[PDB]
Structures are given as structure tokens and as C-alpha cells.
mmCIF file of all heavy atoms in Angstrom:
data_model
loop_
_atom_site.group_PDB
_atom_site.id
_atom_site.type_symbol
_atom_site.label_atom_id
_atom_site.label_comp_id
_atom_site.label_asym_id
_atom_site.label_seq_id
_atom_site.Cartn_x
_atom_site.Cartn_y
_atom_site.Cartn_z
ATOM 1 N N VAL A 1 0.870 -1.215 0.045
ATOM 2 C CA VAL A 1 -0.019 -0.049 -0.021
ATOM 3 C C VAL A 1 0.851 1.199 -0.042
ATOM 4 O O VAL A 1 1.884 1.260 0.717
ATOM 5 C CB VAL A 1 -0.989 0.002 1.166
ATOM 6 C CG1 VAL A 1 -1.582 1.218 1.308
ATOM 7 C CG2 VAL A 1 -1.963 -1.252 0.974
ATOM 8 N N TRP A 2 0.589 2.186 -0.870
ATOM 9 C CA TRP A 2 1.120 3.482 -0.878
ATOM 10 C C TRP A 2 0.102 4.431 -0.250
ATOM 11 O O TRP A 2 -0.973 4.517 -0.763
ATOM 12 C CB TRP A 2 1.671 4.027 -2.259
ATOM 13 C CG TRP A 2 2.870 3.258 -2.739
ATOM 14 C CD1 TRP A 2 3.643 2.449 -2.013
ATOM 15 C CD2 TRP A 2 3.357 3.369 -4.074
ATOM 16 N NE1 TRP A 2 4.661 1.898 -2.755
ATOM 17 C CE2 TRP A 2 4.446 2.462 -3.962
ATOM 18 C CE3 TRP A 2 3.005 3.910 -5.250
ATOM 19 C CZ2 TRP A 2 5.276 2.223 -5.219
ATOM 20 C CZ3 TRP A 2 3.729 3.726 -6.341
ATOM 21 C CH2 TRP A 2 4.925 2.922 -6.305
ATOM 22 N N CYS A 3 0.478 5.194 0.654
ATOM 23 C CA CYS A 3 -0.367 6.315 1.155
ATOM 24 C C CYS A 3 -0.242 7.614 0.335
ATOM 25 O O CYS A 3 0.776 8.070 -0.021
ATOM 26 C CB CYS A 3 0.058 6.672 2.661
ATOM 27 S SG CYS A 3 -0.298 5.275 3.723
ATOM 28 N N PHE A 4 -1.371 8.181 -0.027
ATOM 29 C CA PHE A 4 -1.598 9.424 -0.760
ATOM 30 C C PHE A 4 -2.356 10.390 0.118
ATOM 31 O O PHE A 4 -3.436 9.887 0.692
ATOM 32 C CB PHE A 4 -2.109 9.136 -2.041
ATOM 33 C CG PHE A 4 -1.307 8.388 -3.042
ATOM 34 C CD1 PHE A 4 -1.457 7.050 -3.175
ATOM 35 C CD2 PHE A 4 -0.557 9.111 -3.987
ATOM 36 C CE1 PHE A 4 -0.708 6.374 -4.125
ATOM 37 C CE2 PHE A 4 0.201 8.341 -4.981
ATOM 38 C CZ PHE A 4 0.125 7.032 -5.048
ATOM 39 N N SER A 5 -1.926 11.639 0.152
ATOM 40 C CA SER A 5 -2.871 12.724 0.910
ATOM 41 C C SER A 5 -4.148 12.937 0.062
ATOM 42 O O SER A 5 -5.163 13.317 0.739
ATOM 43 C CB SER A 5 -1.961 13.992 1.050
ATOM 44 O OG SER A 5 -1.034 13.763 1.968
ATOM 45 N N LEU A 6 -4.090 12.783 -1.205
ATOM 46 C CA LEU A 6 -5.096 13.141 -2.179
ATOM 47 C C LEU A 6 -5.190 12.210 -3.357
ATOM 48 O O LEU A 6 -4.195 11.564 -3.575
ATOM 49 C CB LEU A 6 -4.794 14.615 -2.639
ATOM 50 C CG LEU A 6 -5.894 15.231 -3.441
ATOM 51 C CD1 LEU A 6 -7.105 15.264 -2.741
ATOM 52 C CD2 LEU A 6 -5.423 16.758 -3.873
ATOM 53 N N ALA A 7 -6.339 11.972 -3.791
ATOM 54 C CA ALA A 7 -6.669 11.078 -4.931
ATOM 55 C C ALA A 7 -8.031 11.452 -5.539
ATOM 56 O O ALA A 7 -8.733 12.188 -4.840
ATOM 57 C CB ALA A 7 -6.809 9.559 -4.645
ATOM 58 N N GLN A 8 -8.246 11.221 -6.792
ATOM 59 C CA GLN A 8 -9.429 11.558 -7.602
ATOM 60 C C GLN A 8 -9.808 10.358 -8.432
ATOM 61 O O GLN A 8 -9.060 9.270 -8.415
ATOM 62 C CB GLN A 8 -9.108 12.723 -8.510
ATOM 63 C CG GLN A 8 -8.019 12.381 -9.534
ATOM 64 C CD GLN A 8 -7.555 13.579 -10.371
ATOM 65 O OE1 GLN A 8 -6.379 13.932 -10.370
ATOM 66 N NE2 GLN A 8 -8.476 14.051 -11.092
ATOM 67 N N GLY A 9 -10.967 10.279 -9.057
ATOM 68 C CA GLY A 9 -11.409 9.369 -9.975
ATOM 69 C C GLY A 9 -11.786 7.981 -9.330
ATOM 70 O O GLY A 9 -11.946 6.974 -9.942
ATOM 71 N N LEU A 10 -11.954 7.947 -7.990
ATOM 72 C CA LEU A 10 -12.405 6.858 -7.277
ATOM 73 C C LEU A 10 -13.863 6.781 -7.055
ATOM 74 O O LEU A 10 -14.481 7.796 -7.158
ATOM 75 C CB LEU A 10 -11.635 6.703 -5.844
ATOM 76 C CG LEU A 10 -10.160 6.623 -6.011
ATOM 77 C CD1 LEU A 10 -9.474 7.000 -4.646
ATOM 78 C CD2 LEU A 10 -9.535 5.232 -6.580
ATOM 79 N N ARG A 11 -14.331 5.749 -6.627
ATOM 80 C CA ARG A 11 -15.782 5.612 -6.036
ATOM 81 C C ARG A 11 -15.592 4.972 -4.677
ATOM 82 O O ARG A 11 -15.239 3.694 -4.660
ATOM 83 C CB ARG A 11 -16.767 4.863 -7.043
ATOM 84 C CG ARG A 11 -18.115 4.916 -6.711
ATOM 85 C CD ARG A 11 -18.915 4.504 -7.857
ATOM 86 N NE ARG A 11 -18.850 3.138 -8.074
ATOM 87 C CZ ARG A 11 -19.526 2.223 -7.561
ATOM 88 N NH1 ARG A 11 -20.445 2.416 -6.624
ATOM 89 N NH2 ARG A 11 -19.321 0.797 -7.742
ATOM 90 N N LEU A 12 -16.032 5.568 -3.614
ATOM 91 C CA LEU A 12 -15.916 5.135 -2.257
ATOM 92 C C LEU A 12 -17.298 4.256 -1.961
ATOM 93 O O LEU A 12 -18.352 4.914 -2.217
ATOM 94 C CB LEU A 12 -15.581 6.281 -1.145
ATOM 95 C CG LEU A 12 -14.489 7.065 -1.613
ATOM 96 C CD1 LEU A 12 -14.271 8.267 -0.529
ATOM 97 C CD2 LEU A 12 -13.229 6.215 -1.831
ATOM 98 N N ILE A 13 -17.119 3.030 -1.556
ATOM 99 C CA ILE A 13 -18.231 2.122 -1.400
ATOM 100 C C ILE A 13 -18.647 2.005 0.101
ATOM 101 O O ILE A 13 -17.744 1.741 0.775
ATOM 102 C CB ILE A 13 -17.923 0.804 -2.106
ATOM 103 C CG1 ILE A 13 -17.623 1.113 -3.545
ATOM 104 C CG2 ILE A 13 -18.985 -0.164 -1.944
ATOM 105 C CD1 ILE A 13 -18.739 1.869 -4.260
ATOM 106 N N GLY A 14 -19.905 2.156 0.488
ATOM 107 C CA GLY A 14 -20.472 1.931 1.855
ATOM 108 C C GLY A 14 -19.985 2.993 2.828
ATOM 109 O O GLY A 14 -19.777 4.063 2.285
ATOM 110 N N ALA A 15 -20.157 2.747 4.047
ATOM 111 C CA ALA A 15 -19.881 3.641 5.174
ATOM 112 C C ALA A 15 -18.571 3.104 5.845
ATOM 113 O O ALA A 15 -18.160 2.083 5.654
ATOM 114 C CB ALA A 15 -21.047 3.627 6.160
ATOM 115 N N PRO A 16 -17.864 4.015 6.520
ATOM 116 C CA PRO A 16 -16.560 3.604 7.085
ATOM 117 C C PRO A 16 -16.734 2.522 8.155
ATOM 118 O O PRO A 16 -17.739 2.464 8.738
ATOM 119 C CB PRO A 16 -16.109 4.966 7.689
ATOM 120 C CG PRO A 16 -16.868 6.074 7.012
ATOM 121 C CD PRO A 16 -18.252 5.455 6.895
ATOM 122 N N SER A 17 -15.603 1.691 8.241
ATOM 123 C CA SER A 17 -15.460 0.609 9.418
ATOM 124 C C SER A 17 -14.158 0.878 9.896
ATOM 125 O O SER A 17 -13.178 1.147 9.320
ATOM 126 C CB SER A 17 -15.787 -0.739 8.788
ATOM 127 O OG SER A 17 -15.400 -1.712 9.649
ATOM 128 N N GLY A 18 -14.032 0.709 11.289
ATOM 129 C CA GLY A 18 -12.778 0.609 12.103
ATOM 130 C C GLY A 18 -12.262 -0.804 12.061
ATOM 131 O O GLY A 18 -11.190 -0.898 12.490
ATOM 132 N N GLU A 19 -12.936 -1.814 11.691
ATOM 133 C CA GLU A 19 -12.598 -3.211 11.836
ATOM 134 C C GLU A 19 -11.277 -3.518 11.208
ATOM 135 O O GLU A 19 -11.186 -3.127 9.964
ATOM 136 C CB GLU A 19 -13.643 -4.144 11.328
ATOM 137 N N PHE A 20 -10.329 -3.953 12.021
ATOM 138 C CA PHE A 20 -9.000 -4.458 11.423
ATOM 139 C C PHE A 20 -8.288 -3.339 10.721
ATOM 140 O O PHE A 20 -7.399 -3.741 9.820
ATOM 141 C CB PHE A 20 -9.188 -5.727 10.534
ATOM 142 C CG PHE A 20 -9.663 -6.906 11.355
ATOM 143 C CD1 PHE A 20 -10.577 -7.722 10.817
ATOM 144 C CD2 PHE A 20 -9.233 -7.253 12.613
ATOM 145 C CE1 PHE A 20 -11.020 -8.968 11.438
ATOM 146 C CE2 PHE A 20 -9.608 -8.330 13.315
ATOM 147 C CZ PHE A 20 -10.549 -9.133 12.690
ATOM 148 N N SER A 21 -8.621 -2.024 11.055
ATOM 149 C CA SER A 21 -7.893 -0.936 10.356
ATOM 150 C C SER A 21 -6.295 -1.166 10.440
ATOM 151 O O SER A 21 -5.926 -1.251 11.692
ATOM 152 C CB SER A 21 -8.318 0.361 10.889
ATOM 153 O OG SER A 21 -7.581 1.383 10.106
ATOM 154 N N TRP A 22 -5.609 -0.970 9.365
ATOM 155 C CA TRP A 22 -4.175 -1.001 9.402
ATOM 156 C C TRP A 22 -3.619 0.186 9.931
ATOM 157 O O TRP A 22 -2.485 0.234 10.222
ATOM 158 C CB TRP A 22 -3.716 -1.340 7.984
ATOM 159 C CG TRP A 22 -4.074 -2.646 7.409
ATOM 160 C CD1 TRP A 22 -3.920 -3.970 8.006
ATOM 161 C CD2 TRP A 22 -4.544 -2.864 6.083
ATOM 162 N NE1 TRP A 22 -4.389 -4.805 7.143
ATOM 163 C CE2 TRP A 22 -4.687 -4.323 5.968
ATOM 164 C CE3 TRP A 22 -4.859 -2.135 5.022
ATOM 165 C CZ2 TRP A 22 -5.330 -4.874 4.816
ATOM 166 C CZ3 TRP A 22 -5.503 -2.631 3.850
ATOM 167 C CH2 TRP A 22 -5.583 -3.978 3.827
ATOM 168 N N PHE A 23 -4.337 1.271 10.085
ATOM 169 C CA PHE A 23 -3.845 2.645 10.550
ATOM 170 C C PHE A 23 -4.643 3.017 11.808
ATOM 171 O O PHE A 23 -5.835 3.320 11.679
ATOM 172 C CB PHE A 23 -3.931 3.617 9.427
ATOM 173 C CG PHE A 23 -3.186 3.205 8.228
ATOM 174 C CD1 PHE A 23 -3.677 2.601 7.177
ATOM 175 C CD2 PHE A 23 -1.807 3.510 8.170
ATOM 176 C CE1 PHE A 23 -3.112 2.285 6.036
ATOM 177 C CE2 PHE A 23 -1.127 3.180 7.051
ATOM 178 C CZ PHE A 23 -1.682 2.546 5.976
ATOM 179 N N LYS A 24 -4.033 3.026 12.963
ATOM 180 C CA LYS A 24 -4.577 3.265 14.214
ATOM 181 C C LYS A 24 -5.448 4.498 14.281
ATOM 182 O O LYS A 24 -4.856 5.551 13.839
ATOM 183 C CB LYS A 24 -3.492 3.377 15.457
ATOM 184 N N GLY A 25 -6.650 4.519 14.646
ATOM 185 C CA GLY A 25 -7.532 5.692 14.798
ATOM 186 C C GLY A 25 -8.259 6.152 13.539
ATOM 187 O O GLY A 25 -8.883 7.131 13.539
ATOM 188 N N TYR A 26 -8.060 5.355 12.454
ATOM 189 C CA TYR A 26 -8.693 5.678 11.153
ATOM 190 C C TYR A 26 -9.723 4.528 10.914
ATOM 191 O O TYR A 26 -9.334 3.398 11.193
ATOM 192 C CB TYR A 26 -7.651 5.743 10.062
ATOM 193 C CG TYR A 26 -6.792 7.011 10.228
ATOM 194 C CD1 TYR A 26 -5.511 6.725 10.722
ATOM 195 C CD2 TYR A 26 -7.112 8.160 9.634
ATOM 196 C CE1 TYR A 26 -4.671 7.877 10.846
ATOM 197 C CE2 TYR A 26 -6.149 9.217 9.669
ATOM 198 C CZ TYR A 26 -4.950 9.143 10.363
ATOM 199 O OH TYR A 26 -4.161 10.203 10.431
ATOM 200 N N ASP A 27 -10.821 4.951 10.304
ATOM 201 C CA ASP A 27 -11.936 4.026 9.769
ATOM 202 C C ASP A 27 -11.685 4.064 8.262
ATOM 203 O O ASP A 27 -11.226 5.064 7.634
ATOM 204 C CB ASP A 27 -13.309 4.614 10.196
ATOM 205 C CG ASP A 27 -13.356 4.785 11.650
ATOM 206 O OD1 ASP A 27 -13.004 3.689 12.509
ATOM 207 O OD2 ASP A 27 -13.663 5.870 12.229
ATOM 208 N N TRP A 28 -11.972 2.847 7.499
ATOM 209 C CA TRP A 28 -11.804 2.793 6.143
ATOM 210 C C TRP A 28 -13.049 2.569 5.393
ATOM 211 O O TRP A 28 -14.046 2.057 5.991
ATOM 212 C CB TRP A 28 -10.832 1.628 5.822
ATOM 213 C CG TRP A 28 -11.304 0.291 6.450
ATOM 214 C CD1 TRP A 28 -10.744 -0.165 7.665
ATOM 215 C CD2 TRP A 28 -12.117 -0.730 5.965
ATOM 216 N NE1 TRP A 28 -11.462 -1.382 7.947
ATOM 217 C CE2 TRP A 28 -12.234 -1.658 6.914
ATOM 218 C CE3 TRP A 28 -12.854 -0.725 4.798
ATOM 219 C CZ2 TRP A 28 -12.997 -2.696 6.663
ATOM 220 C CZ3 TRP A 28 -13.567 -1.937 4.577
ATOM 221 C CH2 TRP A 28 -13.725 -2.800 5.705
ATOM 222 N N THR A 29 -13.103 2.996 4.007
ATOM 223 C CA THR A 29 -14.009 2.747 3.104
ATOM 224 C C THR A 29 -13.379 2.197 1.798
ATOM 225 O O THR A 29 -12.146 2.560 1.642
ATOM 226 C CB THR A 29 -14.714 4.035 2.781
ATOM 227 O OG1 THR A 29 -15.408 4.366 4.041
ATOM 228 C CG2 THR A 29 -15.683 3.959 1.634
ATOM 229 N N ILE A 30 -13.876 1.172 1.216
ATOM 230 C CA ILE A 30 -13.496 0.565 -0.044
ATOM 231 C C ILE A 30 -13.382 1.621 -1.089
ATOM 232 O O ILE A 30 -14.440 2.367 -1.264
ATOM 233 C CB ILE A 30 -14.237 -0.572 -0.467
ATOM 234 C CG1 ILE A 30 -13.986 -1.907 0.457
ATOM 235 C CG2 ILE A 30 -14.013 -1.087 -1.942
ATOM 236 C CD1 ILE A 30 -15.105 -2.959 0.520
ATOM 237 N N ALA A 31 -12.205 1.885 -1.813
ATOM 238 C CA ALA A 31 -12.051 2.774 -2.973
ATOM 239 C C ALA A 31 -11.876 1.875 -4.230
ATOM 240 O O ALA A 31 -10.981 1.245 -4.393
ATOM 241 C CB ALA A 31 -10.818 3.609 -2.721
ATOM 242 N N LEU A 32 -12.937 2.020 -5.021
ATOM 243 C CA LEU A 32 -12.913 1.371 -6.461
ATOM 244 C C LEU A 32 -12.456 2.452 -7.354
ATOM 245 O O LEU A 32 -12.693 3.648 -7.207
ATOM 246 C CB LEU A 32 -14.224 1.020 -6.838
ATOM 247 C CG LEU A 32 -14.867 -0.173 -5.890
ATOM 248 C CD1 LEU A 32 -16.204 -0.639 -6.489
ATOM 249 C CD2 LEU A 32 -13.957 -1.199 -5.544
ATOM 250 N N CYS A 33 -11.892 2.053 -8.528
ATOM 251 C CA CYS A 33 -11.759 2.834 -9.801
ATOM 252 C C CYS A 33 -13.182 3.365 -10.123
ATOM 253 O O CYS A 33 -13.961 2.457 -10.264
ATOM 254 C CB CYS A 33 -11.049 2.204 -10.833
ATOM 255 S SG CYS A 33 -10.991 3.183 -12.293
ATOM 256 N N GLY A 34 -13.450 4.638 -10.236
ATOM 257 C CA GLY A 34 -14.688 5.221 -10.607
ATOM 258 C C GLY A 34 -15.095 4.832 -12.015
ATOM 259 O O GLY A 34 -16.239 4.891 -12.355
ATOM 260 N N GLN A 35 -14.037 4.457 -12.716
ATOM 261 C CA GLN A 35 -14.348 4.232 -14.255
ATOM 262 C C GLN A 35 -14.645 2.668 -14.462
ATOM 263 O O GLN A 35 -15.758 2.333 -14.887
ATOM 264 C CB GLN A 35 -13.089 4.794 -15.004
ATOM 265 C CG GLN A 35 -13.268 4.505 -16.563
ATOM 266 C CD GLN A 35 -12.472 5.466 -17.255
ATOM 267 O OE1 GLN A 35 -12.907 6.543 -17.771
ATOM 268 N NE2 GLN A 35 -11.236 5.083 -17.497
ATOM 269 N N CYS A 36 -13.875 1.817 -14.072
ATOM 270 C CA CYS A 36 -13.854 0.468 -14.277
ATOM 271 C C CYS A 36 -14.263 -0.485 -13.165
ATOM 272 O O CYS A 36 -14.466 -1.760 -13.494
ATOM 273 C CB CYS A 36 -12.529 -0.131 -14.822
ATOM 274 S SG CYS A 36 -11.234 -0.312 -13.724
ATOM 275 N N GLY A 37 -14.223 0.058 -11.946
ATOM 276 C CA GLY A 37 -14.642 -0.652 -10.780
ATOM 277 C C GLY A 37 -13.605 -1.470 -10.073
ATOM 278 O O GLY A 37 -13.865 -2.285 -9.174
ATOM 279 N N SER A 38 -12.492 -1.479 -10.702
ATOM 280 C CA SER A 38 -11.228 -2.302 -10.134
ATOM 281 C C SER A 38 -10.925 -1.776 -8.580
ATOM 282 O O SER A 38 -11.074 -0.636 -8.384
ATOM 283 C CB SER A 38 -9.977 -2.078 -10.894
ATOM 284 O OG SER A 38 -8.842 -2.653 -10.319
ATOM 285 N N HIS A 39 -10.699 -2.749 -7.719
ATOM 286 C CA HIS A 39 -10.479 -2.345 -6.315
ATOM 287 C C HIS A 39 -9.069 -1.764 -6.212
ATOM 288 O O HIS A 39 -7.970 -2.362 -6.438
ATOM 289 C CB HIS A 39 -10.625 -3.623 -5.405
ATOM 290 C CG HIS A 39 -10.284 -3.318 -4.004
ATOM 291 N ND1 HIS A 39 -9.800 -3.992 -3.073
ATOM 292 C CD2 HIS A 39 -10.447 -2.074 -3.387
ATOM 293 C CE1 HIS A 39 -9.654 -3.501 -2.028
ATOM 294 N NE2 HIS A 39 -10.074 -2.276 -2.056
ATOM 295 N N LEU A 40 -9.003 -0.350 -6.046
ATOM 296 C CA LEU A 40 -7.724 0.351 -6.009
ATOM 297 C C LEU A 40 -7.141 0.479 -4.623
ATOM 298 O O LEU A 40 -5.860 0.777 -4.425
ATOM 299 C CB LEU A 40 -7.870 1.629 -6.745
ATOM 300 C CG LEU A 40 -8.010 1.498 -8.277
ATOM 301 C CD1 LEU A 40 -7.758 2.915 -8.879
ATOM 302 C CD2 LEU A 40 -7.046 0.511 -8.909
ATOM 303 N N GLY A 41 -7.933 0.394 -3.488
ATOM 304 C CA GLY A 41 -7.513 0.527 -2.183
ATOM 305 C C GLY A 41 -8.676 0.901 -1.177
ATOM 306 O O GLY A 41 -9.672 0.417 -1.305
ATOM 307 N N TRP A 42 -8.264 1.781 -0.406
ATOM 308 C CA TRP A 42 -9.120 2.368 0.748
ATOM 309 C C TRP A 42 -9.030 3.855 1.047
ATOM 310 O O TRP A 42 -7.940 4.387 0.890
ATOM 311 C CB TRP A 42 -8.912 1.523 2.086
ATOM 312 C CG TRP A 42 -8.967 -0.042 1.886
ATOM 313 C CD1 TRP A 42 -10.080 -0.706 2.018
ATOM 314 C CD2 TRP A 42 -7.996 -0.817 1.314
ATOM 315 N NE1 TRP A 42 -9.836 -2.082 1.688
ATOM 316 C CE2 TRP A 42 -8.594 -2.125 1.298
ATOM 317 C CE3 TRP A 42 -6.655 -0.628 0.953
ATOM 318 C CZ2 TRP A 42 -7.828 -3.307 0.805
ATOM 319 C CZ3 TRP A 42 -5.963 -1.691 0.557
ATOM 320 C CH2 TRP A 42 -6.441 -3.026 0.329
#
């Protein structure tokens, strides 16, 4: 995983979850490619 301060062209799916977060104190949302729906990260 590479951390970015900023990204565009994604589609964030669902509501955030704290479950098994790799980064202490952050909740995550699935980030798909907004064009093709490929899973690009969180």
C-alpha cells in the first residue's frame, strides 16, 4: 500500500468501518476505480 494525501477518479463504497484498520485511529471505506470498478484501495 502507498499512502496518498489526495486522490481523484475513485468511487468510495459503503460507510466507514474501524474493523481491522491497518492505521490506528482511522476508519476505512473501499475505494474502487470510478471508471472500471477495479479495487484500488481504501
Side-chain angles (χ1 to χ4, degrees), residues 1-18 20-23 25-42:
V1 167
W2 288 350
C3 295
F4 291 92
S5 292
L6 189 51
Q8 61 183 124
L10 301 160
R11 186 164 74 84
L12 306 182
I13 297 311
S17 171
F20 293 140
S21 179
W22 293 311
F23 299 97
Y26 296 90
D27 308 311
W28 50 266
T29 295
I30 287 164
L32 303 185
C33 176
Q35 181 159 267
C36 76
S38 163
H39 180 212
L40 292 188
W42 306 268

